[PDB]
Amino acid sequence: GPSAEEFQQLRKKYTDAGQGHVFAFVDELQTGERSQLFHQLSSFDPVRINELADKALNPPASLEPLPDIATASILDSDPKDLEQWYEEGLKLVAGNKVAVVLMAGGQGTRLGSSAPKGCFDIGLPSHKSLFQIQAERIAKLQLLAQRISGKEAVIPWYVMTSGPTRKPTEEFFEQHKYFGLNKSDVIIFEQGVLPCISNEGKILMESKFKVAVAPDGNGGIYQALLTSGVREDMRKRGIEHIHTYCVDNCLVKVADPVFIGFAASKQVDIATKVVRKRNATESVGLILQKNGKPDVVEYSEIDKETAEAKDPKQPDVLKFRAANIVNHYYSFKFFESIELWAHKLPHHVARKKIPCIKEGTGEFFKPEKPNGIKLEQFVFDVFPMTPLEKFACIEVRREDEFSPLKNARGTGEDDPDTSKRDIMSQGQRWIEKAGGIVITVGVEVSPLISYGGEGLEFLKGREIKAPAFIEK
Numbered sequence: 523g524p525s526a527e528e529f530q531q532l533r534k535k536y537t538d539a540g541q542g543h544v545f546a547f548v549d550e551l552q553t554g555e556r557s558q559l560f561h562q563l564s565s566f567d568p569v570r571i572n573e574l575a576d577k578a579l580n581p582p583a584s585l586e587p588l589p590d591i592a593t594a595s596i597l598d599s600d601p602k603d604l605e606q607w608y609e610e611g612l613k614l615v616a617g618n619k620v621a622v623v624l625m626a627g628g629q630g631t632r633l634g635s636s637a638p639k640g641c642f643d644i645g646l647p648s649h650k651s652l653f654q655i656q657a658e659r660i661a662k663l664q665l666l667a668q669r670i671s672g673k674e675a676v677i678p679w680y681v682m683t684s685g686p687t688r689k690p691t692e693e694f695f696e697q698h699k700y701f702g703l704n705k706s707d708v709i710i711f712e713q714g715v716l717p718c719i720s721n722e723g724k725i726l727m728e729s730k731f732k733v734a735v736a737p738d739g740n741g742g743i744y745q746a747l748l749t750s751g752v753r754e755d756m757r758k759r760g761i762e763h764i765h766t767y768c769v770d771n772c773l774v775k776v777a778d779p780v781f782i783g784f785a786a787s788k789q790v791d792i793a794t795k796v797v798r799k800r801n802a803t804e805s806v807g808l809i810l811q812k813n814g815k816p817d818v819v820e821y822s823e824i825d826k827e828t829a830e831a832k833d834p835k836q837p838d839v840l841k842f843r844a845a846n847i848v849n850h851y852y853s854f855k856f857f858e859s860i861e862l863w864a865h866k867l868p869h870h871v872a873r874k875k876i877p878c879i880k881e882g883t884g885e886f887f888k889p890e891k892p893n894g895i896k897l898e899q900f901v902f903d904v905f906p907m908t909p910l911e912k913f914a915c916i917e918v919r920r921e922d923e924f925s926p927l928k929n930a931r932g933t934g935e936d937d938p939d940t941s942k943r944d945i946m947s948q949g950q951r952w953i954e955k956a957g958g959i960v961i962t963v964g965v966e967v968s969p970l971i972s973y974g975g976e977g978l979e980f981l982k983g984r985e986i987k988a989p990a991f992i993e994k
């Protein structure tokens with residue numbers, strides 16, 4: 523019983539807003555289930571929900587590649603610059619100035635796992651989860667940074683989850699003792715939610731006592747950094763540089779020192795990585811300059827014309843081919859401005875099949891056709907807020923840096939088999955370059971042995987029979 527007169531004023535607000543049907547079932551509810559609905563409805567402003575539904579449902583460009591000033595490439599940067607960025611990056615780690623934010627609030631709808639995507643075991647000989655691989659890269663990088671400071675290096679690991687992934691993720695991290703990181707340096711927090719909206723603009727009811735909600739997209743990171751206390755913790759620690767990435771990339775160079783030292787040396791607010799797009803239809807965002815500003819056209823939003831546009835003088839090469847691999851740098855100073863622009867991030871509309879109560883009956887039904895929409899903010903929608911001179915984009919090698927897990931085994935791409943093959947082909951490559959000989963497919967190299975190919979001299983001359991696993 524959370525008051526009765528408060529229940530009344532809340533009912534007025536929703537009914538005035540044309541959303542009174544959320545109370546249609548109140549008179550047959552337990553006291554617990556009533557209190558659930560009251561509290562959760564009180565967390566949403568129904569007028570604001572109408573505004574969003576209206577823009578989504580009744581909705582109302584100069585478009586060029588990024589100029590050369592804002593762009594760089596691992597593939598053709600002066601090696602003096604690559605070494606200098608690497609060294610400076612590593613200095614910043616050794617200065618305890620580098621934090622990581624892992625975006626891991628995804629559902630993995632194409633993967634159809636029961637567990638968080640970061641728990642998934644892609645069938646490596648180690649059977650290590652994506653999370654563990656990433657934790658060991660952090661572990662290894664901390665050790666590398668010690669080797670040029672002679673002091674302990676800490677990179678705090680902020681892990682952003684959704685309501686659906688938060689509990690299993692914390693249990694997994696706990697069961698694995700945080701993969702050998704200090705639990706005090708790993709913070710698990712949660713992104714926010716928005717209500718799912720029917721095609722007619724009506725809030726959808728999951729049960730007779732609960733509204734259907736969904737995570738607010740990876741662009742919900744910003745808001746969540748404030749409300750979780752994470753930005754505060756970063757400030758306390760003296761963090762100045764933050765690498766943000768998606769959980770699903772099994773090759774991700776966590777806190778990559780070249781990237782950090784590149785961005786810091788340019789004094790950007792924001793930097794981002796790309797790879798050459800694989801073909802016209804790859805499900806990647808494209809980074810470009812839109813209306814004079816840095817920006818991303820998401821794969822779900824691009825038209826055929828722009829996706830298939832060819833380069834004037836290279837008729838089989840796409841004009842727009844800087845594929846977003848969700849690897850971002852921010853200055854800490856950028857995050858200090860979140861309150862000024864968080865509310866300006868647009869809401870992207872996705873038409874979704876949302877299980878709910880049929881308004882009228884109460885029969886909790888799984889719908890056939892998309893009955894409603896989910897709204898999501900995207901992390902990269904801050905790019906057009908950022909001046910070109912304070913933005914930087916750097917090309918990396920797909921085979922070293924981007925191998926996403928989108929689909930279930932059996933698909934044939936961006937799946938557990940392509941992921942394993944990419945990690946094991948990278949390990950063989952590194953071993954062969956250090957003098958090792960591989961019989962033979964591929965070799966898994968623990969990040970604790972090598973972060974990025976270093977430290978493998980001990981393998982010179984040794985014959986390794988693939989498939990193998992190099993651990994301590």
Ligand SMILES: CC(=O)N[C@H]1[C@@H](OP(=O)(O)O)O[C@H](CO)[C@@H](O)[C@@H]1O
Pocket residue numbers: 740768805806807808820821845846847848900901902926928
């Ligand atoms: C909002 C966002 O981060 N979108 C990203 C993200 O797409 P998904 O819809 O999450 O698969 O990962 C892609 C790379 O796997 C990237 O190209 C795209 O732009």
Ligand SMILES: Cn1ncc(Br)c1N
Pocket residue numbers: 587796797798799841842843844845917
């Ligand atoms: C010239 N160009 N366009 C996309 C990307 Br990647 C590069 N290098």
Ligand SMILES: Cn1ncc(Br)c1N
Pocket residue numbers: 791856859862863907908
């Ligand atoms: C994108 N933006 N707007 C104000 C400020 Br300070 C920043 N970084």
Ligand SMILES: Cn1ncc(Br)c1N
Pocket residue numbers: 587588589593594595796809844915916917
């Ligand atoms: C044209 N462009 N976009 C990103 C990057 Br790297 C380059 N060169």
